Design a protein around this ligand. Structure first.
Ligand code: SF4
Ligand code: SF4
Ligand code: F3S
Ligand code: F3S
Ligand code: FES
Ligand code: FES
Ligand SMILES: [Fe+3]
Ligand SMILES: [Fe+3]
Ligand code: NI
Ligand code: NI
Lengths: 633, 633
């Protein structure tokens, strides 16, 4: 089962699923082989009813689509639609939060409030919204209105792009026409331009895709901003991860999906329902996280993470998962059928994300507490139904230190230099104790043995003194393998990196180092990494494409991960992807994305499926940046 | 060549392309056979990087997508993305017009103006915008602002839905949650909900698709409204169609694509450039239409239509097409390579729709006349380059009476009943002289011998006394086969229909009948048919799903045609589609779209590839509606 997942808890549950005859994602993948080579290479188009069209990667006809669309056009159009779909998931998440904040400050949703007043005022100042002599509720109303305005055209571009990147970067992007006019405007323009008989020039199509990827970045940054206002900006917190965080004696409730508008209330209401759970014979309600809504409540409240991404079904296989509470995105719909075998109650809550066979409980922000109690009472009832039934919870968990928002990283560094907090980080980049920075982001993917690329690449980079930060299910992979436990610094980190992590940790009163990898949060919280990198660029007076900073979507899966990788390139970063996106059917498109885009944005994709080789290529990219700054490497 | 097209002019040019070795759309289709059966049935998904996934229509595994997505989910998600893409093309067209009107009345684009003041005031009244004591430019500014506001969420739903359908229909749709909140909002929500791990219930997905199809309707209606304000509401006009409208002695300039913001200015500027063309040795500039921008200038100015849809390359094969001026949508990108063989200068004009190898001349509304002259001077130069070269223009053309906007139809009927113009139409439905109404809409499709379904179905319906109206390339097919020439009424029309067309025509001073088919305009002008049908419903006090009115997208191709067919169903019409959409891989989805949706909206799809059988099924649908009203049939 080591070929399927490198996580021992997942392996144990794969053995249980096999003997119980429960089909998993890995079984459905095996049943799909061999996969279509036209789809794999991007050489398929279904954009009109004359299709499906395909192009042979090599050989004879078909060589061109029925309408005349070339391989370059077909590949670029498919990629652009994936970017638009990712942007749509974001930003839809962000729009939900904006409406929640607006309702909260209008008196329509009293379960929500301004929890982080400092964040609210800082965002207002960033946007140009006046605060002096204004009520907090009025400031927040203007912030929410500004957020909603960024979805459509207006007299300003998308401010959640132009106010979050340094002016010099905005100027580079504007010169190429890449600043988005409105988030949903760009999504629609992509769908238009990629429809039949429209844009048919690869470079033009890809420029459109870069611009739409910045609409995705705006949605990510807006999501982080608004969630921090409503639920609190993360600070360092200690918890645990992996399936061993489930408790046979408790009502185990997974929050799964994406939006803290839902998961944050489940967490608080679950605490009030403790005695109601105890009357049912449980010790209490044990909320655990899956995927990014799990990351949200881990980062803010230390809620333990159960599992992530590709292995999500395995939480159910334990037999101890009483409920799985869903909003949207990254939920394998197989959970609804597996639930019938395991007993778990799967509950959907959002009108636009239902799963046949799963109970639907509308969750309205206006009734959030009451709707949460209805949901948790279904979980309690499910716990009672498994009285006396053995469960198999692998006794496997890691210690996780997390909560490294950009504010928290700056604060930790400020213990070494109070009035110039970024300088200690820069000093150690210059002296070589920190070679560079690598952000691990994105999903697991059934094609890659689970976590193998994240851990293989991270181990090589850490030994070479790279400061590693992580989000999403990349953070999930690293946390489940011990990379967020400071006890593992000696084993994992090069001497220079260990010295820096130790100096920061000891200055923060830990008597020990920061963890080997800094958890910066959910996938929208890739925007936090942007904030950190932009702050470094501004402090140094250079653009982001001169910094020794790289990204790796080492096991990418979702359209959202394609969008994030694309904006990482667009803001100036060398960006590794560890699975094949459907681009190899067009050499011209591949050449643009991996090479000539350097001349547009300074970033570029690094497509590399072998993780050892990917680590070497990421180190070369970091070291090239060091050399460009005149630094030893 | 009769297997490829039923149009003799197209056949002649297919022979020329064959002997000259110029590959056509039909050749590229032949090279594509056999097409992928997974794509044909809808049983393929590429919504994440674990794909491509497929499901065998019948047999053994694969039976389910890797994430667990069932056939029902995969089929519904693909269909929803096609609807969103169609909506994006519209409405993007509409947004362009809204920005043009705004610029015009702000003094920023003096080549544009309020040409139809009556239409402006009527739209303002419909929307609730006050007119008394307001400057026309201020009324128009408010109309343009309202149009742009319908793209995003606000305190009202999309007014280009709720103000254009009768209250009883809006109530039915609202009860099912189908009224769009914002045009681009719905497009983005579709892309979100159909991304991996989101909506996974076929009925829920399809309800979302119906709602997005109404966002498409709003874009269509907005496009017609704004184009009528800017360029004039059509009235009956006489012209010609088919390749014989080209003139060897003139500079032949095709306008191709969609937006009259471009084609209307080409038409007027071409007239000023006559003497500049004559100095180059031409008789003048002969502007001709292709596709819907051709329909726009045909409807408003009587510009002759050269060709449509699938046969567009054949205009170039004549050797006499000096320029082809493009904005966006439905342009085979093959035109850019064919141009090198024929001599034609292909010119793109819109930033988001370029074609490699075609000259790009930005067209800005602020410089429209100057940019038009630059474009036409390239055409003049091209004419000069073909001095002395034989051309082969098939000497084939039909007479076309067109210009039947809903205002024009009402006015024609008012000659029989001045103060109750719809009553003469209703009277003749009741007495059986008019059996019902059928709208032909949409594209040609290379899979269907060109025009064969439109003409076969239309002939059967006309003999059964159906009033036939048409738009887009369905109008194109019918016009090129003589269905818009009143001289053909005796041959084509049943006695009852002939009597009505004759009574209306003679009351309008024609000494003869209206044509066999009424041309209601471009594909956005399917909204005109909605206006007519809604007006009939309101006059009768019944909802649209009780009227003997049907639609037929008999040779559909573009995602826009899928969106239009879907909103035709959503507003209550039996809607034929004459090509297979990618739905047959899921019986549950097919059953919803062809049957159970009757219980939601009263409309339904009729999927039928055999045109004789489709005509019978359309007549049965009309006659069932007649029976429901208590009428003989
Ligand atoms: S858009 Fe072109 S390449 Fe795509 S399915 Fe249609 S004819 Fe084929
Ligand atoms: S969304 Fe599901 S069915 Fe589609 S490609 Fe991904 S794993 Fe396969
Ligand atoms: S929440 Fe989803 S977008 Fe990827 S990072 Fe995890 S599978
Ligand atoms: S303009 Fe296009 S949408 Fe169809 S009706 Fe003609 S091919
Ligand atoms: S031919 Fe397999 S993805 Fe289309
Ligand atoms: S397997 Fe052919 S359309 Fe995907
Ligand atoms: Fe996520
Ligand atoms: Fe059209
Ligand atoms: Ni992610
Ligand atoms: Ni059309």
């Amino acid at each position: 089962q080591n070929l399927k997942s490198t996580d021992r808890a997942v392996q144990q549950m794969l053995d249980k699923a096999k003997r119980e005859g429960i089909q998993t994602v890995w079984d459905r993948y095996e049943a799909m082989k061999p996969q279509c080579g036209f789809g794999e290479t991007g050489l398929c188009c279904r954009h009109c009813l004359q299709g499906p069209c395909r192009i042979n990667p090599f050989g004879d006809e078909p060589k061109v689509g029925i309408c005349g669309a070339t391989a370059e056009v077909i590949v670029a159009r498919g990629l652009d639609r994936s970017i638009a779909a990712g942007a749509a998931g974001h930003s839809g998440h962000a729009k939900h939060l904006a409406h929640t904040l607006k309702k909260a400050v209008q008196g329509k949703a009293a379960s929500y409030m301004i929890k982080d007043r400092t964040k609210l005022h800082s965002i207002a100042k960033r946007l140009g919204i006046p605060t002096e002599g204004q009520k907090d509720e009025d400031i927040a109303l203007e912030v929410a209105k500004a957020a909603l305005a960024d979805f459509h055209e207006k007299d300003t571009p998308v401010l959640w792009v132009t106010t979050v990147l340094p002016p010099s970067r905005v100027k580079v992007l504007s010169a190429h026409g890449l600043i988005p006019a409105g988030i949903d405007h760009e999504i629609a323009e992509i769908m238009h331009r990629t429809s039949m008989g429209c844009d048919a020039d690869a470079q033009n199509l890809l420029l459109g895709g870069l611009r739409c990827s910045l609409a995705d970045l705006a949605g990510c940054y807006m999501g982080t901003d608004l969630a921090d206002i409503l639920f609190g900006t993360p600070a360092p917190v200690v918890t645990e991860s992996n399936l061993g965080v489930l408790k046979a004696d408790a009502v185990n409730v997974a929050v799964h999906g994406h939006n803290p508008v839902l998961s944050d209330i489940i967490v608080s209401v679950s605490k009030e329902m403790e005695n109601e759970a105890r009357a049912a014979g449980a010790t209490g309600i044990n909320v655990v996280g899956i995927c990014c809504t799990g990351n949200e409540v881990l980062m803010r409240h230390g809620i333990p993470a159960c599992t992530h991404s590709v292995s999500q079904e395995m939480a159910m296989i334990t037999g101890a998962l009483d409920a799985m509470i869903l909003d949207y995105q990254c939920i394998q719909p197989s959970v609804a059928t597996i639930a019938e075998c395991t007993g778990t109650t799967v509950i959907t809550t959002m009108e636009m994300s239902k799963i046949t066979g799963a109970t639907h409980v509308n969750f309205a922000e206006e009734a959030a507490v009451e709707n949460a109690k209805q949901i948790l009472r279904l979980a309690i009832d499910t716990f009672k139904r498994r009285k006396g039934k053995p469960v198999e919870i692998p006794n496997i968990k890691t210690k996780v230190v997390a909560g490294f928002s950009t504010e928290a990283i700056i604060n930790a560094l400020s213990k070494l230099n109070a009035n110039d907090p970024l300088k200690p980080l820069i000093d150690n980049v210059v002296n070589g104790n920190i070679r560079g920075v690598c952000l691990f982001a994105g999903c697991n993917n059934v094609k890659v043995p689970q976590d193998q690329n994240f851990t293989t690449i991270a181990r090589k980079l850490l030994k070479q003194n790279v400061l590693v930060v992580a989000t999403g299910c990349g953070a999930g992979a690293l946390m489940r393998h011990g990379f967020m436990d400071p006890a593992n610094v000696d084993e994992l980190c090069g001497d220079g990196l260990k010295a820096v992590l130790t100096a920061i940790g000891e200055a923060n009163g830990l008597g020990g180092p920061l963890p080997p990898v800094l958890h910066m949060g959910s996938c929208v919280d890739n925007s936090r990494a942007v904030a950190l990198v932009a702050a470094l660029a501004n402090r140094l007076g250079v653009d982001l494409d001169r910094l020794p900073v790289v990204a790796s979507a080492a096991e990418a899966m979702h359209e959202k991960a394609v969008a994030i990788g694309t904006w990482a390139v667009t803001i100036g970063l060398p960006t590794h992807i560890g699975v094949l996106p459907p681009i190899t059917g067009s050499l011209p498109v591949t050449q643009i994305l991996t090479s000539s885009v350097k001349d547009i944005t300074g970033g570029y994709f690094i497509v590399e499926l072998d993780p050892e080789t990917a680590a070497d290529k990421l180190l070369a990219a970091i070291n090239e940046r060091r050399a460009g700054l005149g630094l030893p490497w």
